[PDB]
Design a protein around this ligand. Structure first.
Ligand SMILES: Cc1cc(S(=O)(=O)Nc2cnc3[nH]ccc3c2)n(C2CCCC2)n1
Length: 167
């Protein structure tokens, strides 16, 4: 038993809710919150901008030190950093950005990072400003992630489309 509340169960291991991942993180304090990161960990907008703003820019400060030491992530890759006031840890995961021409097949590789964590609060990778079809993203999530994932979908209209079309 865990503290996530109000989720619809999609599969054995995937759950979904119409929620602001920032508010959800603030209430649950999950072990892991997933950020929709880019390779530079520049948290300017979308989920990343929202999460970073909620940390009062501490996420960005930590991220800049990470990049200065290690260089950029790979598309499809990830790193574990602090969760600041939102979670124990933040798993920064880079899904392909369609608006940069990145190969959508890398979406499966991106979701594979979730399997290194038993339970996660997460957005749909490559959705929103990353330009992928969120229905496709949900399908890849369900077919790739084997650990327990609680998906927060900000847009109510999208949440209902995701639920009603889910196979
Ligand atoms: C940008 C952005 C997108 C989302 S979202 O979770 O609601 N995803 C989503 C995906 N595609 C969409 N198309 C039209 C609307 C829409 C929304 N956020 C959340 C708002 C609260 C924190 C993060 N920020």
């Amino acid at each position: 038993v865990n503290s996530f509340s109000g989720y619809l169960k999609l599969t054995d291991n995937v759950y979904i809710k119409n929620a602001d991942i920032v508010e959800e993180a603030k209430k649950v304090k999950p072990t892991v919150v997933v950020n929709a990161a880019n390779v530079y960990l520049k948290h300017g907008g979308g989920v990343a901008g929202a999460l970073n703003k909620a940390t009062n820019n501490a996420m960005q400060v930590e991220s800049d030190d990470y990049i200065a030491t290690n260089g950029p992530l790979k598309v499809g890759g990830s790193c574990v950093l602090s969760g600041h006031n939102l979670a124990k840890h933040c798993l920064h995961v880079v899904g392909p950005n369609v608006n940069k021409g990145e190969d959508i097949q890398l979406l499966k590789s991106a979701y594979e990072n979730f399997n290194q964590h038993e339970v996660l609060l997460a957005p749909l990778l490559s959705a929103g400003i990353f330009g992928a079809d969120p229905i496709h993203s949900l399908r890849v999530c369900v077919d790739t992630v084997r650990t327990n994932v609680y998906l927060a979908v900000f847009d109510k209209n999208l949440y209902d489309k995701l639920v009603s079309s889910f196979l």
